Amino acid sequence: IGPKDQRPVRFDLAWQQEETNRFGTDEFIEYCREIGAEPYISINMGTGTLDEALHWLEYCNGKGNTYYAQLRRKYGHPEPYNVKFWGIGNEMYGEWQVGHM
Amino acid sequence: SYGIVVDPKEVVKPISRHIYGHFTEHLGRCIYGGIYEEGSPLSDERGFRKDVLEAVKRIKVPNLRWPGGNFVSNYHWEDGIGPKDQRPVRFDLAWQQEETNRFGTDEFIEYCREIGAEPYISINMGTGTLDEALHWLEYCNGKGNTYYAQLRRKYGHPEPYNVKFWGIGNEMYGEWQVGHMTADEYARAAKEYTKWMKVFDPTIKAIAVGCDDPIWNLRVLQEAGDVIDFISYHFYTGSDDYYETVSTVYLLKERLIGVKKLIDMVDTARKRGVKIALDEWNVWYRVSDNKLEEPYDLKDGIFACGVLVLLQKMSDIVPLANLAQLVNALGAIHTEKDGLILTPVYKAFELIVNHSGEKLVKTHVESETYNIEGVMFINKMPFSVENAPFLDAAASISEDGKKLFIAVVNYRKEDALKVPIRVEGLGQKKATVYTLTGPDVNARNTMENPNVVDITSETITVDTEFEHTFKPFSCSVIEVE
Amino acid sequence: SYGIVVDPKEVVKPISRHIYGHFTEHLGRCIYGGIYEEGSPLSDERGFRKDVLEAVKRIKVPNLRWPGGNFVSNYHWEDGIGPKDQRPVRFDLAWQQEETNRFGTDEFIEYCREIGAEPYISINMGTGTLDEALHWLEYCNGKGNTYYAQLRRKYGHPEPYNVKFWGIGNEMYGEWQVGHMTADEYARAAKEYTKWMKVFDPTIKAIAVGCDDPIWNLRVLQEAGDVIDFISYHFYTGSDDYYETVSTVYLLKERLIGVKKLIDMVDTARKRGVKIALDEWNVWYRVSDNKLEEPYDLKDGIFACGVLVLLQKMSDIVPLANLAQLVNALGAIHTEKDGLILTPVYKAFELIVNHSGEKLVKTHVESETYNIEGVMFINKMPFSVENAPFLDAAASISEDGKKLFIAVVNYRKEDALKVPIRVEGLGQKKATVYTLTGPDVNARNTMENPNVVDITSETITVDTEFEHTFKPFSCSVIEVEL
Ligand SMILES: O[C@@H]1[C@@H](O)[C@H](O)OC[C@H]1O
Ligand SMILES: O[C@@H]1[C@@H](O)[C@H](O)OC[C@H]1O
Ligand SMILES: O[C@@H]1[C@@H](O)[C@H](O)OC[C@H]1O
Ligand SMILES: O[C@@H]1[C@@H](O)[C@H](O)OC[C@H]1O
Ligand SMILES: O[C@@H]1[C@@H](O)[C@H](O)OC[C@H]1O
Ligand SMILES: O[C@@H]1[C@@H](O)[C@H](O)OC[C@H]1O
Ligand SMILES: O[C@@H]1[C@@H](O)[C@H](O)OC[C@H]1O
């Protein structure tokens, strides 16, 4: 999130590539609005934390003055996205998944 | 009753160059006041003690472990990078000191490149996270455009460091360790860190933590044996008694064979060829505090030669070992503000490392043996050894094949040994014998007298059969051809 | 290249007499039709096959294991005592037969006494209880007036049997065993059974169950290491390939050192001096059934010689070993109704037990070596061995110091080996070489030709230095007067 040119390059462990992060939450939601689809976001339970998932929800759905709701407005979207579908982890049973359980 | 037969034509196996490793922890005066001292008249402008640098170069360090040891288990590596004046001061839980972080990852790597050592970094599994380890690896080894590779460039090193040896936690079994873990926790955590680190850089070698508990070692091997490359073993020994100290070379030997057998009993590990890293070893029995300035005597240096000779013979099973530690803390070198002392434990490395081949040859030793019961280490654990030899040796040859080295330890406390030696198919020649010993088993070097315990040389003439007299409590290398 | 140097004055260690032990389970024709056959023209008044008895006496059995083996884990020893007519017929779940119990504890002990062997009884931990094991021990060893001591006397034996070796369970890790246990279960149970059995008789040696699972071995050693005497190990090997079979002597060697190192790592066990009981071993890879009449050939007998030589050099770690088994079932001896066959596995014992000393002396061997990858056992498990020697040897001396025995295995499949041998301080004398040999690696004895594979003797001249030409796939013992 934030100005594209400032987004960090990460090494994605799943597919072993440099992820530029130039497509991120705001681009994802914009693409959903464009095609008329409800966004369904999966969260990271491998290297992620509860705080991190709550911050993503706040950023997407917060109606108030919390840090992440304000951050969504600062980057261009005063109205909350209202993401209705949240995926609580992905394939956490498989040994191929980072931080499997 | 004593004798040595060597066949230089019969190559038993290579000798891994990494048996001569060292280790520096952020502990007391090992780093700050040891290898590194900003503003010493004895330091260069990077802060590296020049006299220490020279002493370290002379022992040709093949790899150097850093930064711990108990310290790394509460160390966040990012606190140690970037402009020094902006690095935070942290309270180190292990040794209870304010750590300034002025010696950090970039300084350690400069140190390694200076001395010609491979770096060997241990990661923080106590308060650390997988992401944090991957970042460390990315910063060090990343060749691409990831945030941490670019950060390495920004701070002045565009070329990756290529750190080859990664320590997957430190002593995670011990209640003393920050964030210590059960066997099952640590075995799963070792498998998780190693496998993902290897997805980023599959050429690294991963050392997992082992110890004396066979259940612990077995869980680690069962769970991570498909991915790790070594399991580690730490060995500290010594008492005031001469024989009690030096005989524990042969206790170490039985220990290594044990871990080796545990590896054999886990198919994935055995099939992959998982080996042992003896990545902390020394005499350690006199002091117990947060400085560990153990005053090594010649007794202790004979143990050290004994170990180095043992590793020459067993490096197929143990290809990696690191004396704990290089300077001050359990130090082979002891520094003071206006100089340094080279303890007899240093001298052991000075001898063997400068007078040893890359390949072990057939060496058969006849020796009388003794049995002993004694105590070792700071808590005076009882131990016993059966049939420790008074005489041991290992013969090695140079890679080109031009040079033969026969290392000999005479452990006998009172008596010189006159030893018949045979070396198959050797002409009459002159050879040089380098010998490390001193006036008594308790002899030390000091600032005032820095050569009480030193390596002397003597020219001798040698043939298919000859004899030589090995002084008591001595280690010698007969260098031939 | 090849050489042997012996110094008969440097005694390394004693050699445990119990490395040559044997084993008879209630399995197919091992007991019934093997050592025991009531009403046969070949049997005595006790039902003991007399021809089998003579062959068994010839190999000097130091101790004999009974009754199992998988059998014992559903055996109730009380079924096998008292007047034979009143012993109940039971269904043995192990081998799926009607067991008549007509051979029971009293016959087993009579058998041992007749052949001079110490009895070694395994207890039933599968459907058995502590009380039942204590009563067996009381029946065998009680000197007082307890019910079972008296019962032994009532059934015709006033003096206690003094059984010294007691097997605390049999292969309790295996899913195939009746009442099999987890490691934690068996380790607790081994401690409980052993400790109370020793309260009744503190002189007994207890053998607890080990296997290849190192966690299993450790739990047992951790829990019962303060009371047991041995942890046991079972080793079965073999394939159709010659080298693949015999090289497993040196696989066995690494297994034993492994289990020894486990013991070293458990303080109570190490301080107590717990050792290893190799209480089942043989080639076994061709037959899988209820009878296990493995047709041993010379290749398999050379394996067996290799193990006995290995056991002479390692008996301080493995003081007790038992070939599985004596008669018919994996049998050293094979019987029929009108005779017997002595297999090359039997011949290995016949050679070594008759030509071997009580003390091992310094023996240095030079040999070429090979590496091998093979399969072993009925399921053809892959294995590998590094640097197996083509030649091995162990020298021993008699108790009195009078005779020297140099046992030599030539594993080479095709070449005889002319070996130079030095014996320190040895006069120039004549000596005898006993050699186990036969025409090819697959040779067997039969009823028709009972001596195709046999032990030859030959006179030779020896001295401080001599040579001897050792046949390929053979084992020899050079016996010298000192
Ligand atoms: O280890 C160092 C110690 O010797 C010093 O006195 O306090 C700061 C520490 O970093
Ligand atoms: O930190 C300084 C040290 O480097 C020097 O050798 O002695 C004086 C101190 O001020
Ligand atoms: O190596 C260990 C050391 O780091 C700790 O502080 O004390 C116990 C030792 O075994
Ligand atoms: O590890 C063991 C040691 O602790 C003991 O003192 O004697 C034998 C070794 O195998
Ligand atoms: O008791 C059994 C007998 O009935 C069978 O026929 O052969 C041997 C045993 O397993
Ligand atoms: O010894 C074991 C045997 O008793 C069982 O029946 O099959 C597998 C073998 O390991
Ligand atoms: O037990 C191990 C075996 O299973 C393997 O095949 O090769 C090495 C041995 O030590």
Q: Mind giving me the DSSP string for C251-264? A: HHHHHHHHHHHHHH
The ligand placed nearest to the CA atom of residue B103 is 1
B477: closest CA of chain C, how far (Å): 27
Chain B residues in contact with A18 (beta carbon < 8 A): 144-146
Nearest CA to ligand 4 atom 2: C264
B261:C266 CB<8 A: no
A31: closest CA of chain B, how far (Å): 26
Residue with tokens 């060496």: B363
Two structure tokens written together for B392 = 């041991």
Contact C229, C223 (CB under 8 A): no
Kindly give the distance from the C-alpha atom of residue C209 to the centroid of ligand 7, in angstroms, as a whole number: 21
Q: Is the CB of B37 under 6 A from ligand 2?
A: yes
Two structure tokens written together for B198 = 């290897």
Sheet with strand B474-480: strands edge to edge:
B454-462, B429-437, B474-480, B404-410, B391-397, B359-366, B3-14, B417-423, B465-470
B196:A10 CB<8 A: no
A47:B150 CB<8 A: no
Distance in angstroms (rounded) separating the CA atoms of residues C363 and B170: 45
Write out the H or E segment, with its range, that includes residue B365. strand B359-366
The ligand placed nearest to the CA atom of residue C69 is 6
Beta-strand pair B417-423/C22-23: unpaired
Residue with tokens 């500290």: B236
Two structure tokens written together for B32 = 């700050």
Distances (CA, A) of C53 to B190, B365, C33, C321, C447: 60, 49, 13, 21, 18
What are residue C234's phi and psi, to 5 degrees?
A: -115, 135
Q: What is the 3-state secondary structure (H, E, C) of B2-66?
A: CEEEEEEEEEEEECCHHHHEEECCCCCCCCECCCECCCCCCECCCCEEHHHHHHHHHCCCCEEEE
B145:A9 CB<8 A: yes
Q: How many CB atoms lie within 10 A of CB B447?
A: 11
Contact C54, C327 (CB under 8 A): no
Contact B128, B193 (CB under 8 A): no
* B and C: number of Cβ contacts within 8 A: 29
Q: Is C38 strand, coil or helix?
A: coil
| B142, B147, B196 member nearest A98 (Cβ) | B196
Task: Specify the length of chain A in residues.
Answer: 101
Q: Which of B350, B341, B295, B301 is nearest to B451 (CA)?
A: B341
Which residues form ligand 4's pocket by a CB distance below 6 Å?
A: B 254, 383-384; C 264
Kindly give the distance from the C-alpha atom of residue B22 to the centroid of ligand 4, in angstroms, as a whole number: 26
Residue with tokens 């987890």: C182
Distance in angstroms (rounded) separating the CA atoms of residues C436 and C476: 6
Distances (CA, A) of B139 to A74, B151, B201: 31, 7, 12
Contact B19, B379 (CB under 8 A): no
Two structure tokens written together for C237 = 């090997």
Strand partners, C401: none
Q: Is the CB of B40 under 6 A from ligand 2?
A: yes
Which residue out of A7, A10, A11, A17 would a mutagenesis test of the B interface target, given it has the greatest number of B Cβ atoms within 10 Å? A11
Chains B and C are touching, with contact defined as 3 or more CB–CB pairs separated by less than 8 Å: yes
Distance in angstroms (rounded) separating the CA atoms of residues B123 and B68: 9
Kindly give the distance from the C-alpha atom of residue C235 to the centroid of ligand 6, in angstroms, as a whole number: 10
Chain B residues in contact with C254 (beta carbon < 8 A): 264
Position in ligand 2 atom list of the atom nearest CA B337: 6
Kindly give the distance from the C-alpha atom of residue B383 to the centroid of ligand 4, in angstroms, as a whole number: 6
The ligand placed nearest to the CA atom of residue B248 is 4
Where do the domains of chain B lie, and which CATH numbers do they carry?
A: 1-15+357-481 (2.60.40.1180), 16-356 (3.20.20.80)
Which residues of B are catalytic, by number?
171, 280
Task: Specify the length of chain B in residues.
Answer: 481
Kindly give the distance from the C-alpha atom of residue C262 to the centroid of ligand 4, in angstroms, as a whole number: 11
CA closest to A11 among chain B residues = B146
Distance in angstroms (rounded) separating the CA atoms of residues C64 and C122: 11
| B129, B150, B200 member nearest A11 (Cβ) | B200
Contact B228, B189 (CB under 8 A): no
DSSP state of C327: B
A16:B134 CB<8 A: no
Distances (CA, A) of C16 to C40, C114, C116, C229, C236: 37, 22, 16, 15, 22
Q: Is C125 strand, coil or helix?
A: coil
| A10, A16, A47 member nearest B147 (Cβ) | A10
| C218, C254, C265 member nearest B258 (Cβ) | C265
Distance in angstroms (rounded) separating the CA atoms of residues C262 and C264: 5
Chain B residues in contact with C214 (beta carbon < 8 A): 214, 218, 262, 265-266
* Interacting residues of B178 by C-beta distance below 8 A, sequence separation 6+: B70, B73, B74, B93, B94, B126, B127
| C212, C218, C261 member nearest B257 (Cβ) | C261
Q: Is the CB of C8 under 6 A from ligand 5?
A: no
| C212, C215, C264 member nearest B258 (Cβ) | C264
Chain C residues in contact with B265 (beta carbon < 8 A): 212, 214, 258
C262:B214 CB<8 A: yes
Residue type, C127: T
Q: What is the 3-state secondary structure (H, E, C) of C358-417?
A: CEEEEEEEECCEEEEEEEECCCCEEEEEEEEECEEEEEEECCCCCEEEEEEEECCCCCCE
How does DSSP assign C9-36, residue by residue? EEEEEE--GGGGBEE--SSTTSTBTTTB
Nearest CA to ligand 7 atom 4: C383
Kindly give the distance from the C-alpha atom of residue C294 to the centroid of ligand 6, in angstroms, as a whole number: 14
Two structure tokens written together for B352 = 């063997």
Distances (CA, A) of B32 to A12, B53, B336: 38, 14, 12
B265:C214 CB<8 A: yes
Strand partners, C462: C429
Contact B393, B407 (CB under 8 A): yes
- C280 included as an active-site residue: yes
Contact C381, C337 (CB under 8 A): no
How does DSSP assign B153-184, residue by residue? HHTT--S-----EEEE-SSTTSTTSTT---HH
Beta-strand pair A85-87/A40-42: parallel
Contact C361, C9 (CB under 8 A): yes
B213: closest CA of chain C, how far (Å): 8
Find the farthest-apart pair of alpha carbons in chain B and give their distance in angstroms, rounded: 66
Chain B residues in contact with C212 (beta carbon < 8 A): 265
Kindly give the distance from the C-alpha atom of residue C64 to the centroid of ligand 5, in angstroms, as a whole number: 20
Which residue out of B256, B265, B381 would a mutagenesis test of the C interface target, given it has the greatest number of C Cβ atoms within 10 Å? B265
Chain B residues in contact with A94 (beta carbon < 8 A): none
The ligand placed nearest to the CA atom of residue B95 is 1
B214:C218 CB<8 A: yes
Query: Could you tell me the resolution of this structure in angstroms?
Result: 2.3
What are residue B244's phi and psi, to 5 degrees?
A: -65, -35
Q: Which of C319, C306, C204 is nearest to C260 (CA)?
A: C319
